[PDB]
Amino acid sequence: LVIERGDGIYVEDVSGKRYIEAMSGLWSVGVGFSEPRLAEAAARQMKKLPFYHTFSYRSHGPVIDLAEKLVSMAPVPMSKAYFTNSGSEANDTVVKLIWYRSNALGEPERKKIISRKRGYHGVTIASASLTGLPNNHRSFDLPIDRILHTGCPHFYREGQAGESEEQFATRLADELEQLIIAEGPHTIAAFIGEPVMGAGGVVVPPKTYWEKVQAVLKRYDILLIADEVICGFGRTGNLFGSQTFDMKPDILVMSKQLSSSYLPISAFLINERVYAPIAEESHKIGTLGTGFTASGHPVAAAVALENLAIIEERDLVANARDRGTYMQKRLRELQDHPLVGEVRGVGLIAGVELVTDKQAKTGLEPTGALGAKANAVLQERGVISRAMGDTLAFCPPLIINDQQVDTMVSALEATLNDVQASLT
Amino acid sequence: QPNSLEARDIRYHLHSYTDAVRLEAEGPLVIERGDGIYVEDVSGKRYIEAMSGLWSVGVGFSEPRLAEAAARQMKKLPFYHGPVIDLAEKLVSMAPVPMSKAYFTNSGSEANDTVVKLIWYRSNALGEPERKKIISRKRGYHGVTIASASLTGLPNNHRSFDLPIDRILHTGCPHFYREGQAGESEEQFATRLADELEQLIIAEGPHTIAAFIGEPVMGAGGVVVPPKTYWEKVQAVLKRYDILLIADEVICGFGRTGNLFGSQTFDMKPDILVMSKQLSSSYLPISAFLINERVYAPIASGHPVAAAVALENLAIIEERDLVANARDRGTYMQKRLRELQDHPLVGEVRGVGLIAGVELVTDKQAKTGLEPTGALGAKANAVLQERGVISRAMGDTLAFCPPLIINDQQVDTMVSALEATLNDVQASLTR
Numbered sequence: 109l110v111i112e113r114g115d116g117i118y119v120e121d122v123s124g125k126r127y128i129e130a131m132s133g134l135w136s137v138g139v140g141f142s143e144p145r146l147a148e149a150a151a152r153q154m155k156k157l158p159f160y161h162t163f164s165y166r167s168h169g170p171v172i173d174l175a176e177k178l179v180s181m182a183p184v185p186m187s188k189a190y191f192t193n194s195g196s197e198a199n200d201t202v203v204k205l206i207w208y209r210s211n212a213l214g215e216p217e218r219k220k221i222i223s224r225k226r227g228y229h230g231v232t233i234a235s236a237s238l239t240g241l242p243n244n245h246r247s248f249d250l251p252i253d254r255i256l257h258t259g260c261p262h263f264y265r266e267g268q269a270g271e272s273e274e275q276f277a278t279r280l281a282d283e284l285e286q287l288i289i290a291e292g293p294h295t296i297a298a299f300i301g302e303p304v305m306g307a308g309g310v311v312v313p314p315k316t317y318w319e320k321v322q323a324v325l326k327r328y329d330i331l332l333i334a335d336e337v338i339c340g341f342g343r344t345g346n347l348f349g350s351q352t353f354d355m356k357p358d359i360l361v362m363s364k365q366l367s368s369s370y371l372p373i374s375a376f377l378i379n380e381r382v383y384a385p386i387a388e389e390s391h392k393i394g395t396l397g398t399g400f401t402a403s404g405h406p407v408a409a410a411v412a413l414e415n416l417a418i419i420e421e422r423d424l425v426a427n428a429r430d431r432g433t434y435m436q437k438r439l440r441e442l443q444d445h446p447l448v449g450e451v452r453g454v455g456l457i458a459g460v461e462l463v464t465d466k467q468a469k470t471g472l473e474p475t476g477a478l479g480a481k482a483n484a485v486l487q488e489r490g491v492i493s494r495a496m497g498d499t500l501a502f503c504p505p506l507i508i509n510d511q512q513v514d515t516m517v518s519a520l521e522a523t524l525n526d527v528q529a530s531l532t
Numbered sequence: 533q534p535n536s537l538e539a540r541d542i543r544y545h546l547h548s549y550t551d552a553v554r555l556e557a558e559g560p561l562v563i564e565r566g567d568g569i570y571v572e573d574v575s576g577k578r579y580i581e582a583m584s585g586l587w588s589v590g591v592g593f594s595e596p597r598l599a600e601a602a603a604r605q606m607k608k609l610p611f612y613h614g615p616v617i618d619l620a621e622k623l624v625s626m627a628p629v630p631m632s633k634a635y636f637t638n639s640g641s642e643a644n645d646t647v648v649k650l651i652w653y654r655s656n657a658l659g660e661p662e663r664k665k666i667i668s669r670k671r672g673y674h675g676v677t678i679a680s681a682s683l684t685g686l687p688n689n690h691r692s693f694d695l696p697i698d699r700i701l702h703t704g705c706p707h708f709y710r711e712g713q714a715g716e717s718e719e720q721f722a723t724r725l726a727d728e729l730e731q732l733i734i735a736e737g738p739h740t741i742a743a744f745i746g747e748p749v750m751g752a753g754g755v756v757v758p759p760k761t762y763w764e765k766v767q768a769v770l771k772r773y774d775i776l777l778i779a780d781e782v783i784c785g786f787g788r789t790g791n792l793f794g795s796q797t798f799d800m801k802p803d804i805l806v807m808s809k810q811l812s813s814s815y816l817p818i819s820a821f822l823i824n825e826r827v828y829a830p831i832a833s834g835h836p837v838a839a840a841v842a843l844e845n846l847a848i849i850e851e852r853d854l855v856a857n858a859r860d861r862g863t864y865m866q867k868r869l870r871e872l873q874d875h876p877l878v879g880e881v882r883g884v885g886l887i888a889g890v891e892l893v894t895d896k897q898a899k900t901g902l903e904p905t906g907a908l909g910a911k912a913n914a915v916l917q918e919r920g921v922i923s924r925a926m927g928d929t930l931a932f933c934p935p936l937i938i939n940d941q942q943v944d945t946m947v948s949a950l951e952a953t954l955n956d957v958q959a960s961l962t963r
């Protein structure tokens with residue numbers, strides 16, 4: 109599919125056919141595809157100071173404004189923001205700084221990071237190791253040493269016979285605790301998780317998961333890294349997924365909706381517990397020996413600022429919350445469709461996992477075929493979704509209205525009816 | 533003034549490559565705007581940006597054509613996962629040796645990281661699970677991801693970070709002034725480096741070595757120009773053991789060394805070429821790497837706004853003859869800088885094309901500076917900045933890497949400021 113242009117929630121192919129971009133591109137184009145104020149911010153900044161770096165005691169106005177704004181918006185108290193170009197680089201730098209921090213605290217053995225199966229955190233050698241999907245690892249010799257993976261919190265696929273949702277949450281927290289014990293708790297630096305796993309299939313954790321996991325972490329004083337690359341800036345019904353799931357991270361990683369992907373920029377926030385010992389170590393060494401050339405890029409930072417100003421002025425968090433409520437309700441009305449195994453989601457993100465045998469939870473051979481089949485029909489009906497195996501994902505822009513949500517979910521129902529007719 | 537830019541920076545902003553405790557005490561220097569080769573701080577003082585920012589702002593700091601390219605794309609299709617296709621085609625067509633495919637990333641770091649990951653994937657696809665080691669060099673700079681900071685050969689990039697990771701090796705720095713033994717000539721030193729590389733390869737098991745990575749000229753490690761014959765002798769080694777050559781042209785690319793690529797200046801024939809920086813003049817973040825058919829055969833999403841800017845940047849370079857401009861001003865800069873070789877504070881002047889390093893010492897026979905090494909560099913860089921020129925100190929070396937748009941009169945101004953700076957520093961040391 110060759111996409112050429114976009115407008116609001118829509119994109120157009122070269123032939124002129126219009127689609128709802130129900131993924132907001134790559135989970136990221138929050139303000140839609142034609143926000144003129146972002147081009148205005150970019151052009152203005154690029155003619156004033158198109159580039160300056162933030163190395164060696166240098167700065168500029170856009171990065172200063174954006175650092176202040178991100179710290180001020182944090183869902184828990186934070187101390188500093190640090191800027192990169194991507195989500196992958198941010199998670200990579202986070203891992204490195206955790207290792208530095210542990211060295212800075214006299215803990216040379218506290219270097220292990222716990223991630224999760226089906227988690228997605230990037231593509232660098234380190235951040236692809238954090239990622240818990242098989243194809244990111246296969247043939248790349250990953251994961252690197254120090255990166256561990258605990259279970260995926262996906263009740264529909266991991267729950268045991270007869271187990272309840274809250275028991276499943278208890279079992280995942282207990283399995284985490286067993287992992288920490290078996291490794292040696294003093295060796296565990298951090299735990300990383302997305303509030304809701306996006307790329308892994310829009311996996312919403314079971315109720316009480318994050319409370320119980322945080323209890324475990326807190327017992328051993330392990331750092332929590334909230335990966336808000338997808339969930340950040342209104343996706344889940346609040347400004348951050350950490351608010352929606354009552355998470356209290358030490359480190360919060362952002363990208364994507366930060367600039368609505370109009371330019372490459374990413375950031376993470378660290379609290380005082382993280383910052384203070386890194387600062388002291390940088391002073392003994394003489395510098396903090398990391399950073400990307402374009403870290404804090406002034407044009408990207410100007411666009412991000414204007415993007416956040418628009419999300420606040422137009423009440424887009426609330427807009428996403430309310431259209432999300434409607435979308436979640438509409439999608440769950442398809443539960444009794446013969447092809448619908450599970451509907452899951454919160455706020456303005458959802459997944460619909462397709463099956464041909466509800467009791468066995470199985471689809472066509474191989475798993476993925478059913479999702480590919482339905483996704484082709486859905487596209488043909490004017491809706492671009494992402495297939496993750498047999499799950500179709502929905503993550504539309506924050507500017508969507510109810511009428512557009514109705515259009516998108518009706519196309520999904522007509523799609524599933526079509527696919528059902530092809531198989532009978 | 534709690535609401536000044538400087539105060540707000542100290543409160544909220546964790547900087548790269550900065551001592552955080554010192555930043556809290558002094559605050560940043562805040563840059564406001566740019567004009568050609570100049571930038572201006574928030575207090576209104578102007579400086580020649582003799583480093584082009586971070587070796588990167590090739591077209592200077594006020595090129596409104598790039599602003600229009602960005603806005604045009606941003607108003608058509610601001611993102612999707614056309615300019616990316618056009619840019620890939622252009623980079624392949626400009627390559628200094630035949631190339632097959634272009635891949636995009638945001639940063640030089642991610643490019644190098646991806647290159648390492650692709651090499652591993654490739655050796656696995658070829659059924660060579662042990663051919664995974666990468667040889668880099670001391671003082672090399674290749675970026676800051678966990679993998680690419682491991683390729684980097686500088687201690688500030690490793691200390692307290694637990695790097696380098698396994699599989700990354702480092703051979704010697706090809707810096708004759710610092711590494712040449714008593715009575716060794718420049719060419720003999722080249723011979724010895726190629727021999728030490730070969731010894732490394734033999735000792736590790738040649739079947740285990742996948743690739744060698746080098747910058748044609750090492751930038752961030754101090755503008756180290758390799759000895760004559762080095763690249764020829766190295767390349768003969770690597771070819772003997774079928775090792776891939778990765779040319780990291782992040783700095784050297786797009787006219788910096790007197791030719792379009794540093795690979796042409798040094799007669800390198802890489803299999804993989806990494807680019808960033810002058811690719812877009814840093815007006816937006818974008819990087820790329822190219823691979824040849826040898827690389828691509830067993831293994832057979834750029835950002836569109838960034839790509840549209842990189843395309844327009846390349847067109848400007850081409851239309852305004854900036855590679856030739858840089859070559860000719862480079863010839864003049866290198867001659868002017870070498871006029872300071874006899875200065876009592878100058879240990880060495882080195883450089884090619886439009887990049888150079890002036891290494892400072894206080895005892896020219898011992899090749900020693902002030903205590904500790906770094907103090908003399910820092911001192912002179914501060915005085916040069918008072919004189920309106922922004923250089924970058926790498927220990928006791930001051931770097932010069934000005935915009936491709938610079939003219940001879942500006943070169944003259946820059947080098948005269950350095951001369952007066954060295955005279956002032958020498959005077960202060962005698963008091």
Ligand SMILES: Cc1ncc(COP(=O)(O)O)c(CN)c1O
Nearest residue numbers: 400401639640641673674675782
């Ligand atoms: C030769 C070289 N390679 C790689 C990099 C890394 O680029 P970035 O800062 O964009 O990650 C740099 C940046 N100074 C460089 O000079």
